[PDB]
Design a protein around this ligand. Structure first.
Ligand code: HEM
Ligand SMILES: [O-]
Length: 153
């Protein structure tokens, strides 16, 4: 798990996201969709977005970004004690949305990228380490639920 010090770093970094949840959420999803176009195809409601300009102009994309980061933030504030929060998300993403764990790896990487892009020189090595551990814990606990369900893709 994460140490008390590491969780403090995670939640400090998270304050940066909370100052502009929609902007961070939008950029995370755009990074995901442009880097990995197959991910867009999982969103029937974003399939029409044929260019990054269209993505940037989509108010619904920003809305979904807010929903995604709000859910993740709730999970992070549990400092690993997130079974009740995480289980339903893992199950909706496997059974309803059909999201392979690879795509969760992609979005985790996108979050790290966006933090550096929006806060260059202000996302230190310690902070990156801690946030990476938190995202890996999130992904890994989802992976355990995916295995329970026998879900791959
Ligand atoms: C940080 C990781 C993620 C979080 C916290 C998250 C959170 C959420 C939440 C809260 C919802 C709405 C409730 C629900 O259906 O369970 C949702 C819906 C959805 N998610 Fe995610 N999600 C994540 C990653 C992903 C990824 C990587 C994909 C696909 C590449 C994805 C695909 C979807 C889709 C297709 C929906 C339904 C969207 C709609 O049509 O309204 N999610 N997600
Ligand atoms: O999502």
């Amino acid at each position: 798990g994460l140490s008390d010090g590491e969780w403090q770093q995670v939640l400090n970094v998270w304050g940066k996201v909370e100052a502009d949840i929609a902007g961070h959420g939008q950029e995370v999803l755009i990074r995901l969709f442009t880097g990995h176009p197959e991910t867009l195809e999982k969103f029937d409601k974003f399939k029409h977005l044929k260019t990054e300009a269209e993505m940037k102009a989509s108010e619904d994309l920003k809305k979904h970004g807010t929903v995604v980061l709000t859910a993740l933030g709730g999970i992070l504030k549990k400092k690993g004690h997130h079974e009740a929060e995480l289980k339903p998300l893992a199950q909706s993403h496997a059974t309803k949305h059909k999201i392979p764990i690879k795509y969760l790896e992609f979005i985790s990487d996108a979050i790290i990228h966006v933090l550096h892009s929006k806060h260059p020189g202000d996302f230190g090595a310690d902070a990156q380490g801690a946030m990476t551990k938190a995202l890996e814990l999130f992904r890994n606990d989802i992976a355990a639920k995916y295995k329970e369900l026998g879900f791959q893709g």
